[PDB]
Amino acid sequence: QVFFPVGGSYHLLSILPSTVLNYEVSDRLYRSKIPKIRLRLLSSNAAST
Amino acid sequence: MKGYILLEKVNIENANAFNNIIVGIPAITSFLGFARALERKLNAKEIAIRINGVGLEFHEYELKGYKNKRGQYVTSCPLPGSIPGQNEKKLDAHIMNQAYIDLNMSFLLEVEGPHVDMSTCKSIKSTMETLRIAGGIIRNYKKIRLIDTLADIPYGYFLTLRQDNLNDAAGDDMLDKMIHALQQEDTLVPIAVGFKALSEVGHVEGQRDPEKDHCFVESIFSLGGFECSKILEDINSCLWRYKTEEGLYLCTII
Amino acid sequence: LKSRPENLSFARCLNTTEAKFWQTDFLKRHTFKLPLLITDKAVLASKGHEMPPDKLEKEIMDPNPQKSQSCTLSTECDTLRIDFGIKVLPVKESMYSCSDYNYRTAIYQKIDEYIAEDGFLTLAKRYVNNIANARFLWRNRKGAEIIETIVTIEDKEYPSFNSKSFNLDTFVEDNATINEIAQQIADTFAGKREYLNIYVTCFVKIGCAMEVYPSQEMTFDDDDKGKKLFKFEGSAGMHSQKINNALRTIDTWYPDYTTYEFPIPVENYGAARSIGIPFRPDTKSFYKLIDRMILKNEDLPIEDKHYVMAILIRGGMFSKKQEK
Amino acid sequence: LKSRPENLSFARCLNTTEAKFWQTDFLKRHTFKLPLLITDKAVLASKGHEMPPDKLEKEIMDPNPQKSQSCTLSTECDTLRIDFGIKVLPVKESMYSCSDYNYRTAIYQKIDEYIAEDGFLTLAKRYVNNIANARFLWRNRKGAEIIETIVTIEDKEYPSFNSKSFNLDTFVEDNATINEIAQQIADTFAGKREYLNIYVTCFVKIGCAMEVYPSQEMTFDDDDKGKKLFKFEGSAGMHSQKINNALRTIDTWYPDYTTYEFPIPVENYGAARSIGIPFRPDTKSFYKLIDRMILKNEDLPIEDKHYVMAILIRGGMFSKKQ
RNA sequence: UUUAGAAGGAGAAGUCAUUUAAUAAGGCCACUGUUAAAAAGUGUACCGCCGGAUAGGCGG
């Protein structure tokens, strides 16, 4: 959660991640040649949970 | 009495570097939030100024991890100490996605308001020691200077917005356009530039501060490029400033 | 005041940087230094790990190719030098987020009462004591001829220490340099000072062409599974997390201290990785003390106050139990 | 206590550095030394390996291009000089991790008892014996005229050794210098001192422009193929973990010792590559012996105590799955 | 008011035995370095006296 300067006042944000976009990006980067990272910092149990 | 203040060679360690689908340069919203926090810290003090427009000049970078023999990057994370909630008493803790980066960069702030002089630089120097940049920790700095000429900017590569290259590519959805535009030009990199809106303004049970307006957001991604300081066109065409619309909190150049 | 706020968080007031390793000679340690680099290596071992008595009969005589990395001093430099720095910020101006307001006022009042009563001097003296004995040498420390530590604040070069003549189980309170450094740290802790900067440099006479021990990275890869050491700007170094864990090893007020007689790092439940059991799994934990201090007003003993403020300096997310 | 803790590991107590190779002349041994570098060399074999008779007829007369490296002495020096060092640390202050206190106290008590009876003297004598007979030369020991080993402690230069007289099968404990050094090593092992720093310099006379044999790099099937040699600070050298294997050849207490009658390096299962058979594949292994010594709390013969202390000196990862 | 706030990856190790790179050869022709200059900057600081103070002060 962050604070954004809307006008002269402030708004509170509740940032959420888009996992379907992440999966699509993973597929497209799999079938591509752009430099990329794997980021295997996860386990099967955690991903299940 | 408008002017420009340059913070020279600021070193940041363990800065956050993991957006949803981006690893590397942190989001521009982090730098703008740092500038806003600096302005708020000064305004809470006796010196009253205002900051509009920030320019970033990269000098060095280093991702936290190592490089494979195949050329890929493998990122490292600190050992998770303890996590609140369930299973908070066991020695070993769960590991989520994270990345970190060290970077040494210079900042250019377009500051406006009364009493813009060397006293303002001294105040910013005194009050900048209790701040963080994108979750990182400031360690050292070269100096703070008052700059009105473009020729005084040291050597470095600025970061601008190149959404035209994104919009000038084939493909129906802009993911294909972004991928194709990245294939044409190796300089272009994807960066996060703001947040969209996924709900309506309201109040919920449990938040950082139950007085402001709550709104669930998403991460907004675009393209960007690196331009040398010696071949920069103009001072004004390198700044990053806020932009507010109907749930379209964003950072741009203008 | 019925319970803890739904969103309360703190930040660490003791921020350390990444250490960097240099090698030099003892007689010229004040003049020159040389870089220390990390070298890859490969080993060929034998399968000696504990195997089931079925697989053992099949692969007892099998070779074991493995990869590793190592750091080693050169053949003409016999002194290891480690430089780093600390930044100190006030505890009161570190509560980044607090949803409630009465709880914030109560926390400020209790912090002010603790400042008026003690003055944050015990914890400051303990931290400087941990600095002086060079506990930050988790492995290299062992087998050292001479250990020398030097502390500088901004320009004043305080006299050097001798970490060999310091027990790692007892704390010293009678030392002029320790007294003034801890007094300045306590001044920055209470709120009299906006910030404090400290620079630490340690020389170790580990021997000629011996082995030094940098920090080890935590990486995951399908093909490689070897040992990877921390490289900092092309030189060997130590993580800031590892150094910070040594500094906050001040907890001597945990239950059953008379059965163990060694300090442990301060944590929410008193857990330490070295021992494998939590020393505060009960009403001596941080949460129970902070409930017996703020929610129901009660003058806790001085040791529990020390532990609570030591937790607060460490920082964390001490919020309420979140619910759906 | 009933079982080993879920996390248990011992750091090593004998830290050997990495050898560096120099070349010199025997008459000017204490005067000068010269660097010994490594030279590339490509080779052309004639396909001498064993092949099936299908492709043997068609692929026998072909050449074979490979690459490799080599290290030989110069044409003016006939002596090879090897310098390295050892650091000795107490055995008790070596348990890196242990997720139990009862096990730690039991191990400390057992080590105190072993110090009470023996005092870590036999193992110290055997280690100095393995230093004296120059078992660490490996293939450089073959076909040598004079081997002279010198051990220096602090500033006391101990009298030189004649390494060829010692036999690689029996251990001598009657030497004055060997016992004098082993006393300090045992004192460091027990805990009377904090650390010991030994320095070893070996002179081997093999002949003019002969060949020396440094350690060979282990290469996986990723980069390339070909022989690569170990270069320490430019000059050739030996791996630190290869010298430690030679000084670890003290185990003469395994079963069926009378059948073979030679020492073997201290291993968990008693594996010996020089003969290819395992000497401790059963209840005489370290895992079986340490359980009866600590958990069951029973007395053991002093040979098994010697073997257990030798394993503890080397160190390892003695963890236990739940 | 910063995808905010938090963090010990650690212990153990034998890479190795062999080797035939080898035969033959035409680097060739042609060419404008040019004009102008201050090594002087004091060129080297000596005989003596009051100083009993290696304090500090006079004469040619």
CSV table of C-alpha atoms in Angstrom, one decimal, chain B residues 13-14 60 62 64-66 68-70 72 74-82 84-85 88-89 91-92 95 102 125-132 135 137-140 205-211, chain C residues 6-7 11-12 15-18 67 87 89 96-99 194-195 197 199 217-224 228 230-234 240-241 267-269 271-273 276-278 281 287 314 317:
chain,number,residue,atom,x,y,z
B,13,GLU,CA,22.2,-0.5,-2.0
B,14,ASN,CA,19.6,-3.3,-1.9
B,60,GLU,CA,26.6,2.4,-12.4
B,62,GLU,CA,24.8,-4.2,-10.3
B,64,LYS,CA,22.2,-8.8,-6.7
B,65,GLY,CA,23.3,-12.3,-7.8
B,66,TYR,CA,25.6,-13.6,-10.5
B,68,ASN,CA,25.6,-17.8,-15.6
B,69,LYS,CA,28.1,-19.2,-18.1
B,70,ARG,CA,25.2,-19.1,-20.6
B,72,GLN,CA,21.7,-15.4,-18.0
B,74,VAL,CA,20.6,-15.6,-11.3
B,75,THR,CA,19.3,-13.5,-8.5
B,76,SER,CA,20.0,-14.0,-4.8
B,77,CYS,CA,17.8,-13.2,-1.8
B,78,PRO,CA,18.5,-12.7,1.9
B,79,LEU,CA,17.7,-15.6,4.2
B,80,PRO,CA,14.1,-15.1,5.5
B,81,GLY,CA,14.3,-14.4,9.2
B,82,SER,CA,10.7,-14.5,10.5
B,84,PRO,CA,4.2,-12.8,11.1
B,85,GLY,CA,1.0,-14.9,11.0
B,88,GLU,CA,5.7,-17.7,12.8
B,89,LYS,CA,7.6,-19.8,15.4
B,91,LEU,CA,13.0,-21.6,12.2
B,92,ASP,CA,12.6,-21.9,8.5
B,95,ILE,CA,10.4,-17.8,0.2
B,102,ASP,CA,22.7,-1.6,-6.2
B,125,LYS,CA,21.9,17.9,2.6
B,126,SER,CA,21.0,17.8,6.3
B,127,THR,CA,17.6,16.2,5.8
B,128,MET,CA,18.4,13.7,3.1
B,129,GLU,CA,20.3,11.5,5.6
B,130,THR,CA,17.0,10.1,7.0
B,131,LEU,CA,15.5,8.8,3.8
B,132,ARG,CA,15.3,5.7,1.6
B,135,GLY,CA,13.4,0.6,-0.4
B,137,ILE,CA,19.7,2.6,1.8
B,138,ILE,CA,21.7,5.7,0.9
B,139,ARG,CA,25.3,5.3,1.8
B,140,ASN,CA,27.4,8.1,0.1
B,205,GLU,CA,-11.7,-2.5,7.0
B,206,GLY,CA,-7.9,-2.5,7.5
B,207,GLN,CA,-5.5,-0.2,5.7
B,208,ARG,CA,-2.4,1.9,6.2
B,209,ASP,CA,-4.4,5.0,7.1
B,210,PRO,CA,-8.2,5.0,7.5
B,211,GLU,CA,-8.7,8.6,6.5
C,6,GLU,CA,-4.5,-3.3,12.4
C,7,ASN,CA,-1.4,-1.8,10.7
C,11,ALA,CA,12.2,0.3,10.7
C,12,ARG,CA,15.6,-0.7,11.8
C,15,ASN,CA,21.6,0.3,9.1
C,16,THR,CA,24.9,-1.4,8.0
C,17,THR,CA,26.4,-1.5,4.5
C,18,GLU,CA,28.2,-4.2,2.6
C,67,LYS,CA,32.1,-27.4,-8.0
C,87,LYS,CA,24.0,4.7,10.2
C,89,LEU,CA,18.5,7.0,13.3
C,96,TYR,CA,6.6,4.3,9.5
C,97,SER,CA,3.0,3.2,9.7
C,98,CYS,CA,0.4,3.2,12.6
C,99,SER,CA,-3.3,3.0,11.8
C,194,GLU,CA,19.1,13.8,13.9
C,195,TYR,CA,21.5,11.1,12.6
C,197,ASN,CA,27.5,8.0,11.1
C,199,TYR,CA,33.0,3.9,10.1
C,217,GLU,CA,25.0,-16.3,-1.6
C,218,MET,CA,21.6,-18.0,-1.6
C,219,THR,CA,20.8,-19.0,-5.2
C,220,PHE,CA,18.7,-21.6,-7.0
C,221,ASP,CA,19.6,-23.2,-10.3
C,222,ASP,CA,18.6,-26.5,-12.0
C,223,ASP,CA,22.1,-27.4,-13.4
C,224,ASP,CA,24.5,-25.8,-10.9
C,228,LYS,CA,28.8,-19.3,-4.7
C,230,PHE,CA,29.4,-13.0,-2.3
C,231,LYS,CA,31.2,-10.7,-4.8
C,232,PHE,CA,31.0,-7.0,-4.1
C,233,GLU,CA,32.3,-4.7,-6.8
C,234,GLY,CA,34.6,-7.5,-8.0
C,240,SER,CA,24.9,-6.5,5.6
C,241,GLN,CA,22.4,-9.0,7.1
C,267,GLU,CA,14.0,-12.0,18.0
C,268,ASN,CA,10.3,-12.0,18.5
C,269,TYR,CA,10.2,-15.5,20.1
C,271,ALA,CA,14.6,-18.2,18.3
C,272,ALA,CA,18.3,-18.8,17.4
C,273,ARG,CA,19.4,-20.9,14.4
C,276,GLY,CA,17.3,-24.9,17.4
C,277,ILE,CA,14.8,-24.1,20.2
C,278,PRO,CA,12.9,-20.9,20.9
C,281,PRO,CA,7.8,-19.5,23.4
C,287,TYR,CA,4.0,-9.8,22.0
C,314,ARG,CA,15.5,-4.0,15.3
C,317,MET,CA,5.9,-5.6,11.4
